[PDB]
């Protein structure tokens, strides 16, 4: 079934200004049930891939 899960990539980001935790949409191979996980729990290696997708220093 779905014992364990394999995060393929991170494709979404929600930054809460009013004190909401910044969530990341992790696209697993289980992506049918893709979930917004908090950075602390999100694989930082994949996060790096999304951070690098950001147009940094325009």
UniProtKB/Swiss-Prot annotation:
Biological role stated in the UniProt entry: Component of the chloroplast signal recognition particle pathway. Required for post-translational targeting of proteins into the thylakoid membrane but seems to be dispensable for co-translational targeting with a translating ribosome present. May be able to function independently of cpFTSY and FFC/cpSRP54 in targeting LHCPs to the thylakoids. Acts as a highly specific chaperone for LHCPs, preventing aggregation and being able to dissolve aggregates.
Name by which UniProt lists this protein: Signal recognition particle 43 kDa protein, chloroplastic
Stretch of the intact protein here: 316 to 373 of 373
Swiss-Prot/TrEMBL domain comment: The binding to LHCP occurs through the first ankyrin repeat and the L18 domain of LHCP.
Lineage, broadest ranks: Eukaryota, Viridiplantae, Streptophyta, Embryophyta, Tracheophyta
Note: Unlike eukaryotic or prokaryotic signal recognition particle (SRP), the chloroplast SRP from higher plants lacks an SRP-RNA component. It targets both chloroplast-encoded and nucleus-encoded substrates to the thylakoid membrane, post-translationally for the nucleus-encoded proteins and co-translationally for the chloroplast-encoded proteins.
Quaternary structure, from the entry: Homodimer. Component of the cpSRP complex, composed of a FFC/cpSRP54 monomer and a CAO/cpSRP43 dimer. Interacts (via chromo domains 2 and 3) with ALB3 (via C-terminus), but not with ALB3L1/ALB4. Can interact simultaneously with ALB3 and FFC/cpSRP54. Interacts with LHCP and LTD.
Cell compartments where the protein resides: Plastid, Chloroplast stroma
Knockout-associated phenotype: Plants show a reduced level of the major light-harvesting chlorophyll a/b-binding proteins (LHCPs).
Domain called Chromo: residue spans: 6-58
Tissue: Expressed in leaves. Detected in roots.
